[PDB]
Amino acid sequence: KSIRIGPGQAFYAXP
Amino acid sequence: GPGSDLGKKLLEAARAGQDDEVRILMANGADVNADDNTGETPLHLAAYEGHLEIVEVLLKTGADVNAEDMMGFTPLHLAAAWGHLEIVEVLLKHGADVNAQDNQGVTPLHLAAYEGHLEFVEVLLKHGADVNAQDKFGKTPFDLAIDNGNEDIAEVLQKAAK
């Protein structure tokens, strides 16, 4: 994981 | 339908911070609550990009403060996550649901807690944020804060829980 949320980005998104 | 292109121009203008273009497009009847390919409204994109003046204009011309995109985010989710405090406050002042849950059960308090911005946690708590909300993994904002070394927030969240 990592990466802040965004239009096409869930809070929980894989590793 | 008619006006769809104005809505797409408005979405771009809000994302891009084009204050004057937004005003022109609204005066021309653009749909303030049109949404883009992932369900973002102009208010979503303005809050995401930190464009406070445009957030304000969009609210005064009828933006849905609690609109949801395809991930269940509201503008408040995005403004919290990207550290735009004034936008967070303006959104809340205009009826933003402080305890909105996205499609994974994450609330704005979860986000502020994880990111590690104490002032955002305090603001949300002051406006009634739910310290006991659990996301799809049973995690509370406290769990996210403590799992991310944000100890000062974890303690503020604990005292609020009492």
Residue numbers in the entry:
A (entry chain B): 1 to 15
B (entry chain A): 9 to 170
Describing publication, verbatim:
The V3 loop of the HIV-1 envelope (Env) protein elicits a vigorous, but largely non-neutralizing antibody response directed to the V3-crown, whereas rare broadly neutralizing antibodies (bnAbs) target the V3-base. Challenging this view, we present V3-crown directed broadly neutralizing Designed Ankyrin Repeat Proteins (bnDs) matching the breadth of V3-base bnAbs. While most bnAbs target prefusion Env, V3-crown bnDs bind open Env conformations triggered by CD4 engagement. BnDs achieve breadth by focusing on highly conserved residues that are accessible in two distinct V3 conformations, one of which resembles CCR5-bound V3.
In order to define V3-crown epitopes that lead to broad neutralization, we co-crystallized bnDs with V3-IF (BG505), i.e., the V3-crown mimetic that all bnDs bound best. Since bnD.1 and bnD.3 also target the V3 post-CD4 engagement, the conformation adopted by V3 in complex with these DARPins must either be a transitory intermediate state that occurs prior to CCR5 binding or an induced fit upon binding an intermediate. This conformation will hereinafter be referred to as Inter-CCR5-V3. In contrast, the Inter-CCR5-V3 conformation was sampled less often in the MD simulations, suggesting that bnD.1 and bnD.3 must have the means to efficiently interact with V3 prior to the adoption of this V3 state. Despite different preferences for the Inter- or Post-CCR5-V3 conformation, the bnDs overlapped in their contact patterns, engaging mainly with R/H308, I309, P313, F317, and Y318. The R308 side chain engages via a salt bridge with bnD.1 and bnD.2. Overall, we observed that bnD.3 forms eight H-bonds, distributed across six V3 amino acid residues, thus potentially leading to the comparatively high binding affinity observed for this DARPin. Six of these bonds were established with the V3-crown peptide backbone, and as a result, this should make bnD.3 less sensitive to V3 sequence variations. These features probably contribute collectively to the observed higher neutralization breadth of bnD.3 compared to bnD.1, which covers a BSA similar to bnD.3, but only forms four H-bonds with V3. Collectively, this suggests that bnD.1 epitopes are arranged such that a bivalent engagement across the trimer is not possible, and that the bnD.2 epitopes are not accessible for the larger sized bnD.2-Fc in its current design.
